[PDB]
């Protein structure tokens, strides 16, 4: 038992480790998407930049969770980071939709974590989640939804012109 | 077949994918070490900072390999990132020794890759490896060896005072 | 025999002269393309600027090869610079494709030169080629492939709007 | 027929294409001279610099003629650029004399072009030639004559000391 | 055996020690030449400055080789530095010619070292040699050849005026 | 006989040449010590820096003696620079003690030189020695004695911690 541990439940520790793995997996997926868009037969540099930035932010979130785990006296237990489902994301619109799905999954996991923390009467963990993850996920989901809506209205994925102009004007 | 592909062998493509996975694994290991040293019962902030920086550099090396793969017309195929062997690295000296072992393994993989590229007559890949990875690995191995030697002479791992002073003076 | 000549094979000298002629020819071709796009019935000023810049860079590469030839004690022997195959390049997409073909030809010639230098045990010439030409050619080929992919996706050469928007947004 | 073409005779268009080829040939000759003086057994860096600058200026003149051809609605038709007559220019004095001869040839071609433009009643072409080429050629011929006179008085080509001091003091 | 040693052959270690001795010897020779030209009956301050600078650069190269030897886990074994062949270098032209001969000898030794490293499959050592020594030797040999050519053309060693003017204008 | 020579004895000339050789030998020894401390199994960067600086200062003293020899009309006669006695200096304390011994030897040689100059009635040489070498040697010997005393009191060579802390605090 850690000397700093106080009001930190074992269930909360396990949930934090699971969330760490999920954030690392999201970072891996975003990296895969970015370098799909760096391909010579896709060539959407601003899509690639956007997804690389998302990957870096995801890794930062994982590091913040690890820092919280060390702060509360828990012990980090790392697991394998599974590879992304696809190697070819087939379009900017499809990548945006998959990113929206992934962010909604991450948000649902965070909501389950907050529910568990509320059940265990861990106000510090609850406020940590609320302050650092919930609103960030809400804004990320809203932004991805806006991007998907705009791409659909311009006519993606059939319109390479639509994807090109979105890359230049919205992501540039 | 990619429109930009020229003098790029399938064996080289597969070896580059393997090296990408190895660099990502090294990044994961360094992250594990850093947050082991962030623990309340270890509390070596400069060890943690050093290993976090190593993890970021490993990320950058993996991303550079992915960029090279896209440049040469190859296709990136990501695999699972295996978890690190240990959760508890037991000391600064032990972590330094394991990092030295890992860097020597990475250097050996890079040397095998250079040998394969020389066999396949890929001077661009050979020069890429020589310019961006071989000397960096040599300096990293030399630095880790220096750190291990200094820790042993000061009397680690038995001397918490030795580890504390090394953290303050060499890593600070 | 030059007083500075050392480990410089006659085959290498002849290959360097051939490469000088090839670089000058590439410069001529790029100049032709640029002033095709300066025509009143084409009027793509950013295409013209891009190809003029490529012509200048090709000239610089030829001058660097001549400097290397003088450095190693060889003697420069200039030949006729053949005219470009076409006077009318018919579209931005067609010009981009022909430029990609030309850069791949130049890269293949450079790879043959590196193979000859390796056979003749000329590490200085090998490293000169690797440092100054191979990665530049790889990046140029990747960039041209990206441009061709983007033009095709926007719908060139049928879409004058696609060529106009590419000229403004990617080349501007 | 171009939509911008007005008072531009076919004879003038052909003469402009011929002048473009002549300017490119002069650039090639000056490049040859510069890298002759870059040789280890000649080693006159300021002669080499002077002739390289002349080559760049000749290329600029050719590009200006191509721009004029596009402005007047003519069509550029590029020809082979013949190699220079000599590979070895034998001295600074001999190179200066050959450059003077070449500039006089270029000036005579420009005067014939101006005569043709006057015959065809093309005041725009006449004024273009007068503004951009005739006085530049006159000044270049005067400068080359001054250089030749000075080299002869100092005692070139017999006096390597004369050529060295001219390189340092006049061309430096 | 050093803890950092990897893919470093004993033959390569011995060759590196030999090259260290050769670079130190070259530094000694250049120092001798510089202070020959500092003599009251020679009095060529810019020749002395040039050769002193060459001596400093030679020692820097020796130190870089020693650093490489420590980096790769080899052990430096220093030998006697033999005295230069002559105490009186008899002229600026003769000193320049002897320096050219010495640089060609050093370049040949470096080429033999690169051949040995290629045979032992040591890409790091090969790239180290290519990056830090081969092109420097090529430029140094070219510069010395240019100096010798210029001195001969001005009429050295018979012309003390030629040596004086070369000292002032080329080396000043 | 030199035109500038005045009141300069042949014995003084020979003694100056001997002192030049001694200073060069001291520079060589200090270089050996510095790169011993650059080894991966020693790893004392500040010891290495200190001894490299001492080697450079020894270079400068040798060059100043050569300058004096040229000033007084003497002729420099260079000899072989013998290798240092040891390749392994075994500790910071042992290296400091050997450096103290070497500086005392150099000081004794300088005192013998001053005695000879006084005997030959060479006040310029006497004052040159007094101004540029005697007080520097006294200060260097005092500094080395202080370093040896401090290392012994901290407990070197048994205490790698003592050597590490001395490297950080006194030499850093
Ligand atoms: Na994937
Ligand atoms: Na979802
Ligand atoms: Na782990
Ligand atoms: Na290893
Ligand atoms: Na190994
Ligand atoms: Na053409
Ligand atoms: Na091609
Ligand atoms: Na090819
Ligand atoms: Na590129
Ligand atoms: Na020629
Ligand atoms: Na003429
Ligand atoms: Na005439
Ligand atoms: Na000598
Ligand atoms: Na030689
Ligand atoms: Na030694
Ligand atoms: Na002594
Ligand atoms: Na004594
Ligand atoms: Zn749980
Ligand atoms: Zn690609
Ligand atoms: Zn983009
Ligand atoms: Zn990040
Ligand atoms: Zn977050
Ligand atoms: Zn913390
Ligand atoms: Zn746990
Ligand atoms: Zn998986
Ligand atoms: Zn994949
Ligand atoms: Zn709250
Ligand atoms: Zn637009
Ligand atoms: Zn393979
Ligand atoms: Zn903790
Ligand atoms: Zn700390
Ligand atoms: Zn990173
Ligand atoms: Zn790229
Ligand atoms: Zn693949
Ligand atoms: Zn695993
Ligand atoms: Zn773990
Ligand atoms: Zn790297
Ligand atoms: Zn050939
Ligand atoms: Zn036009
Ligand atoms: Zn434009
Ligand atoms: Zn150019
Ligand atoms: Zn190039
Ligand atoms: Zn050069
Ligand atoms: Zn030739
Ligand atoms: Zn032709
Ligand atoms: Zn044409
Ligand atoms: Zn290389
Ligand atoms: Zn005509
Ligand atoms: Zn040459
Ligand atoms: Zn010059
Ligand atoms: Zn130009
Ligand atoms: Zn002009
Ligand atoms: Zn125009
Ligand atoms: Zn025409
Ligand atoms: Zn011809
Ligand atoms: Zn020629
Ligand atoms: Zn050997
Ligand atoms: Zn003198
Ligand atoms: Zn001088
Ligand atoms: Zn130096
Ligand atoms: Zn060097
Ligand atoms: Zn080092
Ligand atoms: Zn050894
Ligand atoms: Zn000797
Ligand atoms: Zn001597
Ligand atoms: Zn004596
Ligand atoms: Zn070592
Ligand atoms: Zn240190
Ligand atoms: Zn010095
Ligand atoms: Zn000194
Ligand atoms: Zn001194
Ligand atoms: Zn003096
Ligand atoms: Zn003497
Ligand atoms: Zn000896
Ligand atoms: Zn030794
Ligand atoms: Zn006094």
UniProtKB/Swiss-Prot annotation, chains A, B, C, D, E, F:
The keyword Isomerase does not apply. Coiled coil: none annotated. It is found in: Cytoplasm; Lysosome; Cytoplasmic vesicle, Autophagosome. Residues 6-155 form the Ferritin-like diiron domain. One of its GO terms (molecular function) is identical protein binding. Pfam families: Ferritin (PF00210). Belongs to the ferritin family. This is Ferritin heavy chain. The lineage of its organism: Eukaryota, Metazoa, Chordata, Craniata, Vertebrata.
């Amino acid at each position: 038992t850690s000397q700093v541990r106080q009001n930190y439940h074992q269930d909360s520790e396990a949930a934090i480790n699971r969330q760490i793995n999920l954030e690392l997996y999201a970072s891996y997926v975003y990296l895969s998407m970015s370098y799909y868009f760096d391909r010579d037969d896709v060539a959407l540099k601003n899509f690639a930049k956007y997804f690389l930035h998302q990957s870096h932010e995801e890794r930062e979130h994982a590091e913040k969770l690890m820092k919280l785990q060390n702060q509360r006296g828990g012990r980090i237990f790392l697991q394998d980071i599974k590879k992304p489902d696809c190697d070819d994301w087939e379009s900017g619109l499809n990548a945006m939709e998959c990113a929206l799905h992934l962010e909604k999954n991450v948000n649902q996991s965070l909501l389950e974590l907050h529910k568990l923390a509320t059940d265990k009467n861990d106000p510090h963990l609850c406020d940590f989640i609320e302050t650092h993850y919930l609103n960030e996920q809400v804004k990320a989901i809203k932004e991805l939804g806006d991007h998907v809506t705009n791409l659909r209205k311009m006519g993606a994925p059939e319109s390479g012109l639509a994807e090109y102009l979105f890359d230049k004007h919205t992501l540039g």
